[PDB]
Structure 1
């Protein structure tokens, strides 16, 4: 699980970084 902790930290850093690096918008589009 210590290795798991390491892997989750790295999972967050990756996805936050990729959303910035690409144009990744939220999925939810609320339309009035």
Structure 2
């Protein structure tokens, strides 16, 4: 690890979690 590309990738997935957490609520409400 401890690579400049591993640290960028690790940040991208942290944000994807935040996003997915939010997106869990939209589908079930629409239909």
Q: Under TM normalisation by the shorter chain, which class is it?
A: 0.5 to 0.7
Higher helix fraction (1 or 2): 2
- Report how many residues are paired: 23
Divergent runs of 4+, >6 A = none
Q: RMSD across aligned C-alpha pairs, in angstroms?
A: 0.8
For structure 2, which runs of at least 5 residues remain unmatched after alignment? 26-31
Question: What is the CA deviation profile of residues 1-32 of structure 1, one whole-angstrom value per residue up to 9, with x for unaligned ones?
Answer: 10001101101010110011114xxxxxxxxx
Unmatched tracts of structure 1, length 5 or more: 24-32
TM normalised by structure 1 equals 0.61
